[PDB]
Structures are given as structure tokens and as C-alpha cells.
Design a protein around this ligand. Structure first.
Ligand SMILES: C[C@@H](CNC(N)=O)C(=O)O
Ligand SMILES: C[C@@H](CNC(N)=O)C(=O)O
Ligand SMILES: C[C@@H](CNC(N)=O)C(=O)O
Ligand SMILES: C[C@@H](CNC(N)=O)C(=O)O
Ligand SMILES: [Zn+2]
Ligand SMILES: [Zn+2]
Ligand SMILES: [Zn+2]
Ligand SMILES: [Zn+2]
Ligand SMILES: [Zn+2]
Ligand SMILES: [Zn+2]
Ligand SMILES: [Zn+2]
Ligand SMILES: [Zn+2]
Lengths: 485, 485, 485, 485
């Protein structure tokens, strides 16, 4: 089996923290309590002066994605290893179906690519990048038989992934029918397309042109529009990579107004800012280029962290989609050709601890909710993951909140040859990572094999996402007025 | 010439009020001052205990518009007479060009229809309901040679007038090029189209279905999106008929954030509410049907009036587009077929005085700004109209703020056979209306002939609308960062 | 011992819901799991088609309080019985120390009064109604030795309980020193005092005068001021009975801005409104009189419920402080003499279920958080109460969410002879209440004895309230700038 | 008489701009029109390529005020000269009555000090720093016979000027009775007093301690509280020197909600920020010390300017209260002893033009409203000043908007030996200043004598401030409900 007893630490769940040992047997947590016996043969991890937390769940990755004429350098193998070294024990990666391509074929191609390579557990969202009867059927199959309750739609990427309002209305309606959550990349793709054209014509070909062609208003607008279409059909919505104060405030206002919408800032938008696009060194500026862009208002990451603490924003991913320096160089003369994407899978947990807990913005329990539990609740496997409790999966991180580590591309485990968080000194270090009941990272070294992680099959109609939707279907039906003809 | 001396009243301009007489000769105000001599032959209007104000300018009319299978019943003749009887001395009506139709032909057809019928002065906005090189040229001709500096675009009316984001971007860009303001009907036409389809399928065929298929979120969304596209191209924007709290707050927030946008609530949204669509009497409910709909939150008209007082909203029109009871009946089985449009041209001034000044929300001077002066400033003929001052046009109303009048279809001068403000007791009565230097309304009787009013030709680049736009063009150009290759 | 097995229900905690039976032995939940064995002698409660939830914790009561010249009619005995019949298993009542009176004496007097009468568990907050060295010491004693980590201060009740800003600053500073939370009744007592004087002078002596003398601005102002003083000293704050949209928005904004403040709406402000004060029947209007008053904007209770769902507001109490019809009549000629206080202890759970869960505003799990768990977290006994889990106290309610019950003073168990929620039909009925491991309410009948409940002694420095405060003390210290003299 | 013809410029009023010459005779503008004749003997000022604007009116000065143990160095003579050189032709200075001192004596002492020294026109506000029957009477005398319709109250300066809520309620009530506007210095004086005590105890004795002891929350709170008390008594309110985003947003929200409140940012808060208090050079940091402090958020002055453009904030003063370097040094060991006050009288017009008009935030006409016209409207002498029009006072500035000037203490005309705007390059230069019909500043040289300016006596009940107040008194009276006993 492999038995492990994590002894002497303080367990930290989303609700409260308490001292207790944790007994792991066979992939599962089988007991949580004080002073547990060490069974003969079991390995003891000494978690004295440490916190024992559910492993991080990164809701947003693109490992080895073919995009913008090249392929991301962190692949399923290296990317999941880097996750583990950074205290993340699950990733959820996007099946990026091409326009006119079968969603089932694209799903199968992702499972074939990832199944033999992942080092930690994972699951998949599926992008719906076009619409038709076939797509409709395949979404039902994916939700009922293939383990997927999240579909990803794009309002940006005109010509490539974009859907118009009438198509989003149909797609969101069908999400609600199959019990799936609708995820959206919310930027106005017409404004992006025109904006870029204008920045190029004015000779602004560098990364500053990338931010200036699609400033935060462009993200805030599409975010409000997605919310409005989703509310019209009573479909739950998930806005991925919220990058700006104004888009975050759209989400904040919609939630206060009782709309079923969740917002996901990412490690990049919580840990750094878009002033980097104006850096004199082209390579440096290019490293940060992603859609939607990081924003040049320096108060952004702190504000996003305050809203993450207060649950205006609810959980975190990384949008890990990495391109090395020579790949980013594809766009040296033309920002539109810089492959979009930044790093974060490995450093998300330390960045959020330093910028959110050490700073006093959120407590350790809210940290667990926004790095693991809420993802498990929304994507429908809580408390199987996201909670240190008997019968839960043994994906556990032993965490030192007092020690710092400096993030550097010289010491990171990602494939990419630079790091958007270079030089950041973070409190909060993953000292030991356990995945599926096995020690896969300890004493700064990984011990794991490609294919050791498993795909997690979820069911639709996640209760955290749907119980309000369903009650509103039952009491919120519009009524005719009764009238003489 | 016709000489008139208005004696003993208190003149009320947008800036301040003061006692003085007003001498009118030849269509113009030629002196303003205390104790003026009555020249032999001049008529004295005794304005003791009255206010002397610029005549109302209704920014938003559709006299005799062919629409939804019939033609509005208030035409240029009757509609302008009704305006005069209600203290409004100018209307600005929309040339509703059809898809694929020449803007110049449609403009000519409106001038031929209106020139021999109007009883008061008027001008025209031109709708841009499709896009092409021809449309581009014709907009330049209209702005430079035909007197028109306002173009009207629709985000609603899918299949009929609607433009997509990329077309709005081009159209707004060209507005800015020709020095015109971009007006928008801001509702999401895809959501309207789907929403109506859904209300019909559920058997909600009455007017309540019309409001429910396009609730205020649908107006607020498109309003934010228009603002965002206009801000992207630095084009000034004018949101016509703001009908809801949430859309008004979008405009309010954009202005505070320094966007060049103006919002226009109408008499309907300031004077009544959408609870009427739920009335047991179908005919009654149908009377209120227009796009965007009046809203069922009863706090709406008061809130819109508070924002009009505070200049979150800046000026007022009526969207006068009237259909008698037997025309509204076209939609007795299907709300989508009810011709959209309500009354207001005649009652706008009294409604706004009662709901805004008598209530203590705004003072008499702000009343003048939101009923005449701001319209003259935005559409580019201030202080020719909108101000009691020497050399200004003699379009003047003698106003009794203490007496009430009850609005009723039994006593109104509009062609329509009902009135959305039926029974409202309003303080503030137009006792005498002067248009082009002639008494056209007094002792409750009109004295005016069809064709007596003139088309007002405006120039582009109105300073109130463009001086900030032009300065931002000069200091707000994006700059490249200077970098080694 | 008394053993109980609650079988066949769905357990509902703040985090998730799941089918399982619950085994109670000796006052405690000793097992939670599927298909549990019934031990010989144990009573089975059949919870098929029911939810099994932690009993409600009412954070805010005033049982038998001597106030405004009389004494509340629901006393510790009747009041706790009524709580039980309504699915509430703990109350937290205010020790209302008089000006210049020893806090220790007042605490002792409350424990002597309540200990032999309560039918359910309870604890106490202590009011700090004056300040001095003695009060300082006694607060430390109360926090460290008497079980109390909450102190209540008043900005209203000039002459009676009010404290000025400089006294609030000192009191809040000392709360933070002893690890207590500062609770505040937030209305401007100078404006109340003047306002009432003015309403009386104008002959408005009825209950409408009570609301009009202290409209919502008066509550919103003091709420912002308390937040600002508490933030200045880094003391955690708890705003009790939030009664208005504007005060709730103050709390909402402060939380988004990362201030450690919690807001507590009560059953009255979630279930009805202040239009009642304008009722033609004086007695009826008087029934609703409390400070701060219910508000005449009908959108209030729904808005408060939306903010409770979204965690702008965090938990609920009742401010139960009841006066029968003949006691309310003390103020028949003068609203200032109407004893302030309404009912709610019994009906809070059904009111919140009907207005919050059945309406689709919050789900069953958020219902548990805002009726029990958050109170246990803030006042420092979670998960001892507020959670169905092994080792937790057996205070458990078997809840039917589908059946309705009509609230009426004819059928309620409170001592008061009317009910502010008279006639309300609520979904969600407590079918069986278990307190301390005993069935105390079932088949509509109570089975409990005075003194059967126990006082719950808490420790200071509740982690849910203090872990951010303490981290901010460690990294948020102001620093001198280093300068040459 | 002295006759002047200002020829060839563009006149800029609050409403619009137009080319015309301006004929000045005898202290007054006697004609405005194109191509005016030069009468023999008249001086022509050639205003080709210049704007002709009403002279600036600085609503907020403290010339030669004895304060904090010394006396401001810019006195009535030097201060008014410096005003003139900077295109400001009127100041309104505060009679700072001491606690227990007669308001009439203090007023007389100011008139005796200023009358023989001012070089431009001026008027006075009177501080009400204590309350009693005498103060009540003297306020009536001041409003009806001494020319003063503005009274200044302080919520800060505990022990020195502070008034409590109940005193503010009485004072504001009596302001409304005498037709005066209530001005407030809005910071919580208890929090200031405690905060300073705490910063000193922690060894933070430098200017950073001054900002940190009273951060923007402290200003925002008192600002909301003043608004709430003023709204309770229907008294018009004027918040002087709005220094922070959060206080400005309080004012913004109150106006949108229809409260009669005006907000006045000053040149300091529009032109620089509080990061200066952290400067390594003590003297430099001390230069900026005033109450309320400048704020360390760098986005502050731009935000205040956006709200000034949008009329959330309405007009501008300087709070000119200058102390030279050796006077500021009184507090070298203890920030509480640094005499509070900064410069601005001379540079206000250029700072606001550069930061507001050249930047594209407001147009030239809004510049006139926020630098002259609105002050004349609120303090009750419009259009006597604040407007280029026939019969108005000839206080006129010939303004070059295209040329820049660098502000420096080396070239300024103020008595103070440094300048908070040192080094700022501003577009917009006053080339010629005319005061009372005389050229007092031209070719960089002043030509004016002490005592040449006059005190301007105003009447109470300014219409811009009172017409809404009075209508609300007439329709907004609370009504009793009619009930059987
Ligand atoms: C495909 C993808 C990758 N990169 C990026 N967005 O910048 C995403 O849009 O989220
Ligand atoms: C055409 C027109 C007419 N009617 C209406 N909108 O309801 C308008 O949309 O403004
Ligand atoms: C004493 C008490 C009772 N009644 C009331 N407030 O109306 C409270 O203020 O909360
Ligand atoms: C007295 C005066 C002077 N200085 C200052 N406030 O910093 C004022 O408070 O406005
Ligand atoms: Zn994306
Ligand atoms: Zn992505
Ligand atoms: Zn329209
Ligand atoms: Zn229209
Ligand atoms: Zn209270
Ligand atoms: Zn209470
Ligand atoms: Zn001050
Ligand atoms: Zn001052």
C-alpha cells in the first residue's frame, strides 16, 4: 500500500485549523486525529512547525498546447512535475478544439497525450469553438460519459475561437441543459482585432502595443456581456483569468446582485503587473505577453488579492502556457506574433501565500479555499480533494509559512527559461508534497514517474454551482398576466 | 416685422435668473433689460408672476415614421403643433434610413415631408443602418453640406437596423472624422431576438412579455459596450432614451471616468414606469410599449430625475412615436407585433417641471439646461437657441410654475387617442409660446400654420462635444518604447 | 446517556450536503456515516425526506430585559423554549450594564437570572456603557475568566448608553488588547436625540415619527464611523442589527477594502419592512418599533438577503426584545416612550429559509453558515457547534424544506401577543429539535425543563476574527523615515 | 475713468467661448462685441492668440493668519499681489474667531487688517468655533449687515476649534435660518488627537507621522458625517479642501443622491501628492504639511481633477497659509508642532490649466466655472464676477494657453521661500491681469497699491445654494398619519 503518517503538524482546511496527525494508506487519508500510532512499516513525515494543507488545484493550464505557430514548452510531464515541486497536486487543462473539429476527437487526443505523462492527477475542460448539432451532441456525451462538466468559450480570438452573442446564448443554454459550467475568456475580440491593427500602423510593434490595443475596458466590457447573456438563460458562468480591477469589479457587482458567476484571477495577475510591457529590454517585456494582458496600474495585483480575500473572486489558476525566449522572439518585429502565455504552475502557491497571507489580506483557511477547495467544489469532486479529512484523496502538502524562498528561473522546475516572478522573495514553502498517497517531492527533489497521475472523471450538476440555478428554475418562471381577449 | 415686448417676468437661463423684459423684433431677441419701452405697434405679453424661458428643444422625435407595418399618427404638422402647446419650440427628428438605402435620399425624403408641415423649427439626425463606402461618403456630405452633425446607430433591431461591434467601430471612427456625434440605441439585439422567441414559446404574448424579454440588464450591457467602442476610437457618444437605473449608472460611471458620453432620459422614463405592462387591460398595457421598455422598478423615474439633476444625465427628449389604440392592436395576440412607441412631445416640459423642479430635485435653471440649452450645445446652435439673450432666436415660453394642469388625452393636442401620463397633475404650465418671434400659442389656443417652422442647418465639430476630444488627440497619442532591436 | 440515531436524512453543513445517519450519545455527535446500526435502547428519529442541520444560533437576544420603564415579556425560560420550537438551539444575550455599574456585577446578575431558566444552551455578550480603569480591568477578567469574548458598545441612546468617539477609540483599543470582538449599535445618538425632539414639536407623535427622526442615513453614518475608529486601532468590529441598504453597503465596502468587520442583519430586517410604521392602526404600527428602525423602502429586506447570500453580511440574530400590546401602549401619545423591540427568536430559521433559500438567493449550505456556523466561528466555539460532525455538540434540527407553516401569534410559542411576521407562509419547518443530545421539540410539542441548557464559556482570540488582525500587527507597523537631523 | 479695450482675443465664459473685444470703463465691463471702436485716450490690450477669461476667485485663503505659535508669511498685501501675478483677482479669506471670542470683533479685526492692504477685491467667511446665544446673534448680524453668507466649522482641532455633533446640528440649523452656507473642515478630530499621540510614542516624529496619524479614512468619515447632519436639518453644506479620493467619493455620492453639498479640492490636492512626506530631506517633507494631509496614493490628484471636470467637485481654492522654512522648523523634532499650511494662491490657475485642460480632462469653459463662476454663484455675486459680460466687474485675465511657464520659488511672488509645485512646467500663462478696471500685472511686473482692492459685501440666500433648499422646505415637510386615538 505505502502507509504514511504525517505527524505533529497543524491541519488547515477552508473552515478551520487544528493540530492533528494524518494517516494515509492506499492513496487515501484514512484517519485524522491527535497522537496517532505509527503502524509498523509506515513512513513518518515530521510536520512539526508546519501546516498540513490539501494540495493546490490549478484550475487553468495549457500544457504543451500548439498555439500561435509553436507549442508550449512546459508539457504534461514537466509541467506536472513543476506543479508538484510548488505544492500543486492537480491541474485542469483545456482541450482546445479547433474550429470545425470534433470535440470528442480533440478530447481523445488530449487524454492520449496526457494520460502517459502526468505526474499528478488532472482533469480537463473542453473548448467549444464553433457550434452545430454535432457540437451539441458531443457536449452531452462529454458531460455524461467522459468526465467533463466545464466548457470553455471565447469572446476574443476573432477568426480562430471567437463566438458571437447569438452563438454564446445557444452554447450557454446547452451548458445549462447538460449540467456543465460555462467558462469564458472575456475580451471583445472585434476591439482587439481593430486595436492591434491600429497600434501596428502607428509603429508600436513592441509588447507595449499588445497592452495598449486591448486596455482593461475591453476585458470589462466582454465580462459584463458574458454575465448578461448567462443570466438571461440562467446558466452558471465562470470568468477565467480575471486580469484587471475593472473586470474584477464587474464580477464583484454581479455576485452582490445574486448572479451565479465565479471569477478566477491567476498567479500572474496576483503577483505582478503590466508595467513590464514598457521595459526597455524587448525580451523582458515579451515574457509577460498573454491575453488578456497584465495591467500597467500597479495597484492591480493588490486589489485583485483583496477581492480574492473577500470572495468577490473565488479561486485561482495560472493559465500556464509557456514559451521560451526563442519562441517569444517569433514576434520581435510584431507583437501580434508573440506566442501568448506566461508561467505560474509551479509558483502559484508561494506567490499567493506571500501576497495574500503574509501581507495580512486573507487568513490560512481562505488560502486553502482559493487554492484547492473551491476548485474541487465548482468542478465537482469535493471533499474528495480540497480537504484534509478521512476518506479524502491523499494529495497533501506540508507547508512552511515562516521560511522564504526566492523564485528564480535558475532554480525552478519549469521548462521555460525565464520566470515572470524572477527575484520575488516569498514566505510559504512546500517542504513535502504527497500525491495519490506517495511522497513525490521532498528535500528539494522530485520522486515521481510520468503517467503516475490519473484523470479525474467528474459528474455534471455540481451542487455548489447548480443548487441555486435549479431553485430559480422552480420559482423564477415568468408568468402571463390573465386578461380578457 | 411683428414686435413683441414680454414685460414684467423673471428671465431664467441655465446660469441664473433675473427680472427683465425681453424685446423681440424680426424673429430675434433684440434687447433684454429692466423697464423697456414699448415701441408703437408692438404687442405686450404681460409676464408678471411668470418665468420667461427658452422654448423646449426635444432632441428625440419620430413624427409620421413608417415602422412595424403602420405609420405614427402624430405627423410633422400635428406633432409640432402639440409641441408648441406644451412649451416646446424645436424638435430633432430621426431620418430612419433603411438598410441598403442611400442616406442622402432618405434625408431628402424627410426634408420634403417635414419642410411644408412643421409649425416650429426643427432639425434632423440621420440613422446609419448599414455600412459601405457609399455610406461613408454620404455621411461626410451630410455633415459638411446638409446641416447634420448627429448620426444614429442601433445595437437592437436585429435584421432591420442592427450593427455588429466591428461595424460600430468603423462607423464611430468615421463619425469622429467628420466631426459628428454618435448616437446609439443601446440594447443587445441578439438577446432581444432570443428573449422574445422564448416569451412567445411560453405563452406570454401580452406586453409583460415585451419587458421580460429585454429586462434592464440587456440595455445596461449594450450601453457599456457602446461606451467602450466609442472610447477606443475617441469618438463622442450620445446614448438616447436611457430607460433604466442600471443603464443610467453605466453612463454615470463613464462620465466620472472622463469618457465623452452624454445620456438622454425621455419624458416617458422620467414620468412613469413599466408596472403598466402588467395591467389587466391589454389596451392600457400596450400603450406603454417601446424599446427599450419602461421598467417595473417604481423607483426608476425618480432616480433618473436625480441623475438628470446632478448631470449624470444631461438632457431630455421624448422619443415621440405614437400609434393609436387600433394600431397598437396589431399586436393583440403577439407583443412582438405591437408598434413600438409612446407619446411625450407635448407633455415633456410640464412632466419634467412637476417631477424635477416642484419636487425639489433640480432648480429652475437646471430645468432650462436639461430642456433646451444642453441640446443646443450638443447639436451646435447655442446660444442661438436655449438662451434668453440679445441676438438669440425668439423661441420663448412664458411659464407659470405655480399653477397646475392635469394631463389628459381628452385635452391634449396630440393625434394619439391616449396619453401615458393620463391624469397626472403637473405644476408648471406654458401660458404663452413664441416661435420665430411670433405668438403661436396663447389662451389655450394655437395660432400657427404648417410650414411656418424652418429646418436649422448645423455645422460639425460642436465645441461642447469636441474640445476635449481634440485635446486628447493632441496629448493622448500612444508612444512606442525606444529599444535596441 | 440517552442514545439517538437520526436515520435516512441528508446532512447539510456550511461546506456541502451528503446523505448519512447521525449517532448521538451523551450530549455529543459520536458518528456520522451511511447505514449506521441502531444500538439497543436508542431512539431512532426518521429523517427520511428531511435535512439534518446544526441547530440555529441566535447571536442577538435580550430575554427579560428591563428597558424603557418595563421588562421584556419573553424571558429566559419562555424565550428559549420558543427558540427551540423554531429550530434555534442557542441564544447569545446581552448583559446590559448600566452607566457606572460594575460589569462583573451585571454579568453575575445575568448568569443568576438565566442559568436556572434556559432550556437551551446560551452565552453572553457584555455591554460597555461607560469607561474607566475599573471597566478596563473588569473587561480583562470577563474575557480571560468568565467566558466572554464580545463587548457591546452603543453610539445611540444619548444619556443612557452612548459613548463618544474618544471613548470608543479607547474601548476598541482595549477590546483588541484582551482578544475580544467589538460589537456596535451604530446610529448617531445626537441626531436621534434632535430628530425626535423635532418630530414631537411638529405633532408627529406616532410610530412614523420614530422612523422619520432617524432615517437610514443616521445608521449608515455611525456604521462608517465605527468602522473607521476600529480600523484606526486594528480592532475587529461587529455591527449588530444592520437594518438598511445604505448601512449594509457601508459594511460591504469596508469588507471589500479588507477591513475586519462583520455585519449582522436580523430576522426583522430580512422578513419585513418599515412601511408598517405608517399603518392606520396605532397598535399595529407600534409593534414594529425598534432601534434602528425597519425601513420604508420595500426593496430593503430582499437586498439585505442578497448581501447575506453573498457574504457582504455574514450571520443573523433577532434582537428579540419583546413587549406586549399593553406595554407598547406606554407610548400611545409619544413614540419616544414606546418600549423598543421586536420578536424573532422563534421564527428566524423559517423566515430566512423562505426569504433566502426558497427564493433562490442562497443555497442550503449558505443557510447553515448564516444561521449557525458563522456565529460559532466568530464567538469561538466552532466546530463544537454549527457543524454536524463527530465530536460536535448534539444540537441538531431535522428540517422539512418542502412543507410550509404559517407564522401567527395564535400558534407561536413566544410570550408576546402579536408577531411582526403575522400571516407569513414560510417554506422550511423544524420537525424535530435536539438540544444537548435530547429531543426537546417534536410533533409540535416541547419537552424541556427550565435550566436544562448550559452557559457556554468561550476563550478570547477567536482565530476566525483574529488571525488577520495578528498578522497585520506583525507586518503593518508604521515605519519612521531615516533622516539627517 | 481709465478706459481699456481688450481687442482680438477669444472670450471664454462657463457656457461657451466666442471671439469679441471687451470694453472696460470705470471699473466695469461696458461692452462685449466684435470690432469695437477704440475711444480716444483708451489703452488697447492686444489679446490676439489669447483667451479673455474672468479673473480667478480663490475661495480659500488665510493671509497673515496667527496659527500654531507663529503667523503666516504671505500677508494681505503680498498674498494679493501674488494672486494677481497668477491670474487670480479675488480671494475669500477666513475670519478665524477664537473660542469664546466675539465673531463681530474678529470680523472687525480682519477688515481693519485687510482693507488697507489688499491689492485685489476680497471677501470673508467667518469661523464659528464655539456656540452660545451670543454667537447665534452675531451670525445673524454678520449675514444681514456685514456682507458674510458663509460660516466655517471645524470637526478637527480638538481643544482649539472643534465642534461636536450636537453643536454642529445647532450651528447648521442656524446657518439655514440666516441664509448662509455651512462650510466644514471635515476630519475626525478625536482620531487625529489619538493618532498623533500614537505616532509620537512610536518615534515617528517626521512629516510621514502627520499623514499616517490621519489617513484618508479619517477625512472621509467626518465628510460623510457632516453631510448627514446637514441633510438632517436641510442646511446647504460646503466641504472645504477635499484632499483624498475617498472623501471626494463621499461628496460625489451625496450629490448624486440629491444632497445640497459642494466639494472644493485645492491647488495642492490637484497638483501634487503626499509621497513628499516620506522624502529623506526633512525640510522638503515639512513644506507639504497641512490638514487634511496630501495623500500618498499617486493617483489622487488626477482623480480629483477628473471629479472636478465632471462636477462631483465644483470649485477650487488654495488654502494658502504659508510658513517659511524657518517657521516650518518649529516642528523639526515633533510633526505636531510644524505650522500647518501650504502655498497656492499664485499658482492655482496655471496648475489647474496644465493638470486639467492641457491634459484633456476638462475644457476651457469648465476651467472658468471651477476657477471663478462657481465661486461667484455660491458666495452670491454672479454674474458681477465670474463672467465676461456687460455690466460685470472688470476683473479680467488675458491668458496664453499654449505657452508654458515653470513654477519656481526663485521666480514666484509669494513671501514663502519654497513652493510645493517647484519645477512644474505648466501650460497656461496669465499675460495681463486687470482688477477693478486697472492693468495691475503685465510684462511680468505688478503695478498695484496696497488697499486698492475692496471688500465685497454679499447678501444671504444665494439662489444657486438655496432655491432647492427652499422648495424642499415647502414640499418635503413630514406628515403625521391620521389615526383613531
Ligand atoms: C490560449 C490561452 C493562452 N494564452 C493566453 N491567453 O495568453 C488563453 O487564452 O487563455
Ligand atoms: C424607432 C424607435 C421607435 N420606437 C421605440 N423605440 O420604441 C426607437 O427605437 O427609438
Ligand atoms: C436594547 C436594544 C433593544 N431594542 C431596540 N434596540 O430596539 C437594542 O438596541 O438593540
Ligand atoms: C487653518 C487651516 C490651516 N492649515 C491647514 N489646514 O493645514 C485650515 O485648516 O484649513
Ligand atoms: Zn484565455
Ligand atoms: Zn487559458
Ligand atoms: Zn431607439
Ligand atoms: Zn427613438
Ligand atoms: Zn441595538
Ligand atoms: Zn439588541
Ligand atoms: Zn481646514
Ligand atoms: Zn483653510
Amino acid at each position: 500500500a505505502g502507509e504514511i503518517l504525517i505527524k505533529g503538524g497543524k491541519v488547515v482546511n477552508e473552515d478551520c485549523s487544528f493540530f492533528s496527525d494524518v494517516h494515509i494508506r492506499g492513496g487515501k487519508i484514512v484517519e485524522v486525529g491527535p497522537d496517532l500510532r505509527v503502524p509498523p512499516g509506515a513512513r513518518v513525515i515530521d510536520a512539526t512547525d508546519r501546516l498540513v494543507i490539501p494540495g493546490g488545484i490549478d484550475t487553468h493550464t495549457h500544457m504543451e498546447l500548439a498555439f500561435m505557430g509553436t507549442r508550449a514548452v512546459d508539457d504534461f510531464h514537466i509541467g506536472t512535475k513543476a506543479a508538484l515541486a510548488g505544492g500543486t497536486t492537480m491541474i485542469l487543462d483545456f482541450v482546445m478544439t479547433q474550429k470545425g473539429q470534433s470535440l470528442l476527437e480533440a478530447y481523445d487526443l488530449w487524454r492520449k497525450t496526457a494520460d502517459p505523462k502526468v505526474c499528478c492527477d488532472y482533469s480537463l475542460h473542453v473548448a467549444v469553438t464553433w457550434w452545430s448539432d454535432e457540437v451539441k451532441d458531443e457536449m452531452r456525451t462529454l458531460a455524461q460519459e467522459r468526465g467533463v462538466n466545464s466548457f470553455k468559450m471565447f469572446m476574443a480570438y476573432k477568426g480562430l475561437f471567437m463566438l458571437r452573442d447569438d452563438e454564446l446564448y445557444a452554447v450557454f443554454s446547452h451548458c445549462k441543459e447538460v449540467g456543465a459550467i460555462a467558462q469564458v475568456h472575456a475580451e471583445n475580440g472585434d476591439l482587439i482585432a481593430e486595436g492591434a491593427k491600429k497600434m501596428l500602423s502607428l509603429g508600436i510593434t513592441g509588447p507595449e502595443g499588445h497592452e495598449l490595443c486591448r486596455p482593461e475596458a475591453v476585458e470589462a466590457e466582454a465580462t459584463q456581456r458574458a454575465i448578461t447573456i448567462a443570466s438571461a438563460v440562467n446558466c452558471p458562468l465562470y470568468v477565467v483569468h480575471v486580469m484587471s480591477k475593472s473586470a474584477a469589479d464587474v464580477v464583484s457587482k454581479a455576485r452582490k446582485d445574486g448572479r451565479v458567476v465565479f471569477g478566477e484571477p491567476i498567479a500572474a495577475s496576483l503577483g505582478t503587473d503590466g508595467t513590464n510591457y514598457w521595459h526597455k529590454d524587448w525580451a523582458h517585456a515579451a515574457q509577460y505577453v498573454m491575453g488578456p494582458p497584465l495591467r500597467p496600474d500597479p495597484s492591480t495585483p493588490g486589489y485583485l488579492m483583496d477581492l480574492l480575500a473577500n470572495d468577490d473572486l473565488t479561486l485561482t489558476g495560472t493559465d500556464n502556457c509557456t514559451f521560451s525566449r526563442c519562441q517569444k522572439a517569433l514576434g520581435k518585429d510584431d507583437f501580434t506574433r508573440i506566442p501568448n502565455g506566461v508561467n505560474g504552475v509551479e509558483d502559484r502557491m508561494s506567490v499567493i501565500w506571500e501576497k495574500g497571507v503574509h501581507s495580512g489580506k486573507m487568513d490560512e483557511n481562505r488560502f486553502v479555499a482559493v487554492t484547492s477547495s473551491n476548485a474541487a467544489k465548482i468542478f465537482n469532486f469535493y471533499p474528495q480533494k480540497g480537504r484534509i479529512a478521512k476518506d479524502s484523496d491523499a494529495d497533501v502538502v506540508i507547508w512552511d509559512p515562516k521560511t522564504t524562498r526566492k523564485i528564480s528561473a535558475q532554480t525552478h522546475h519549469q521548462a521555460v527559461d525565464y520566470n515572470i516572478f524572477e527575484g520575488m522573495e516569498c514566505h510559504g514553502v512546500p517542504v513535502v508534497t504527497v500525491s495519490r498517497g506517495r511522497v513525490v517531492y521532498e528535500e528539494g527533489r522530485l520522486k515521481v514517474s510520468p503517467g503516475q497521475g490519473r484523470f479525474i472523471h467528474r459528474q455534471p450538476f455540481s451542487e455548489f454551482v447548480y443548487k441555486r440555478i435549479r431553485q430559480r428554475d422552480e420559482v423564477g418562471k415568468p408568468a402571463v398576466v390573465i386578461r380578457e381577449p
